Amino acid sequence: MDPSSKPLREIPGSYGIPFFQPIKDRLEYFYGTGGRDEYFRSRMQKYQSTVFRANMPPGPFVSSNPKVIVLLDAKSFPILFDVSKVEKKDLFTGTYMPSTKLTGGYRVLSYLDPSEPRHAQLKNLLFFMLKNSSNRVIPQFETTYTELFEGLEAELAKNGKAAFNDVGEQAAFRFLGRAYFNSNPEETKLGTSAPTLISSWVLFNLAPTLDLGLPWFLQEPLLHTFRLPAFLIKSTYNKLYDYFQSVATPVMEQAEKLGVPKDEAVHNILFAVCFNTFGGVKILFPNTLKWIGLAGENLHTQLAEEIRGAIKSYGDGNVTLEAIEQMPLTKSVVYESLRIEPPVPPQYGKAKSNFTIESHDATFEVKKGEMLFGYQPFATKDPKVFDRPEEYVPDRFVGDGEALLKYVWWSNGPETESPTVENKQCAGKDFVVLITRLFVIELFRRYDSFEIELGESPLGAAVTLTFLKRASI
Length: 473
Ligand code: HEM
Fold this sequence. Notes:
Blueprint: H1 20-31, H2 35-47, E1 51-55, E2 67-71, E3 86-87, H3 117-159, E4 162-163, H4 165-181, H5 194-206, H6 216-223, H7 234-247, H8 249-258, H9 262-295, H10 297-314, H11 321-324, H12 328-340, E5 346-351, E6 355-358, E7 363-366, E8 371-375, H13 376-379, H14 429-446, E9 447-455, E10 462-470
Parallel strand pairs: 2-8
Antiparallel strand pairs: 1-2, 3-5, 4-10, 5-8, 6-7, 9-10
Bound molecules: protoporphyrin IX containing FE.
PDB class: lyase
Assembly: monomeric
Entry title: Crystal Structure of Allene oxide synthase
């Protein structure tokens, strides 16, 4: 509607009694009926607004300031991408930042504002790492995921069911080592334990804001009130560090050229691969498998046809970037997975000055220093942007629908924009889109269709294969 019809109003909501309310609120957030989605929906209903004040976890001792302004609609949300208006310093994980003792004593790239020289240096370093792996991406993905599928197939044939997540995570890390460093981590001292080592380390970092499914009387006192001692995970972290220090030589050498010490470079590479990359794929691949599986054989047949046809005609028998460009449905399927279920839901930004923001029916004033918070899942399901927003529509982005990519924000920026040293958009944006398309491609080069069953998991979606129809033999 016309902005002149959106009156300037006070931001609804209150923070309540300082120490007390944030604790009561995090209890609602983690144990209230409906979970965090209801935490946000109930407030939207209560205040009849997609913009409101609220306290956010972790609260008290871990976080010195739980107060934020929540943004749930597609009109207000984009302010979080505007680095000229919002500061993005030490807020990668929200209203608190994990101890730097968990990251070699350094404040790694993800926590740096673009105004910091190191942000440009380190992000350029990661761009180098990504470009350097370009020639290995497709071949190594094919090799790694063929191994994964052969394994799942064998498990299914012998047991009747095959859980995806675990072996899928092992495959993800195996692929990353091969693509980024031309190294199979399973041949090193890491063996097949990388996923377990990483998960433990990530837990130490994020425990304050993670719901592990434990009862409140156990989870609150031991995970949500105090930070877990960093010296306890040092041993585990060192195993990971030793791996990267030995295989990331070319990236470490480029780091020196950019003015970054080798040690700092390794800690940042470790973080980018284990935290950013692995953690994201651990969530995205199972979710994508889920949405495609729930779509039915009709979609499966169309994807198989498109994928195999493009490979034969444009790839001359092989998977090439040129071939992928000619797979419109596959591209849309991946974008729809990223829209309907953003792998990383929370984005934060702190106001650098006083300015105005607007929802679909009101105008609000934001004061310098206030923490803005956006819950992406609600914003990318805004009915004023997407028809049937709660439904997975496979071809939503095909043809004219491509214009809607301006509203796909999984990477902390419009899908149409590229990450740069000037913004805080995911450095590996194009890489994740490519590998997720490769995941779908490898799946349909081998199978005509598949069936799954879903389980109740805390960190994402638990997917189990119940049937795999082979394309040949
Ligand atoms: C599909 C998997 C991935 C997802 C869902 C994802 C998501 C995100 C999100 C939401 C942010 C913004 C965080 C914030 O400031 O609030 C981000 C930042 C970032 N991501 Fe990713 N990411 C993925 C894969 C990767 C990969 C593979 C790399 C590369 C090694 C990467 C590197 C980065 C970096 C370096 C930043 C911070 C950039 C900066 O400080 O400007 N990401 N990612």
